[PDB]
């Protein structure tokens, strides 16, 4: 495809030594899966790496 640019906002800042950080960005993780636990900045970061996580187990 093409796709575009991403949404406005700034909810990506640094992380203290101990908080959870994003597995797609590299900032911080003010959110968190439940199956998989990982940690993430948006929305879109969360199906990014989850949809990500999937095709790795391969089969099905
Ligand atoms: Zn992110």
Partial sequence: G????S???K???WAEPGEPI????????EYI???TDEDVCSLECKAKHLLQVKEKEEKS
């Fill in 33 to 35: 899966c439940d199956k």
């Fill in 11 to 13: 909810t990506q800042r």
């Fill in 7 to 9: 949404g406005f906002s």
């Fill in 2 to 5: 093409s796709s575009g640019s």
């Fill in 22 to 29: 994003c597995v797609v960005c590299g900032r911080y993780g």
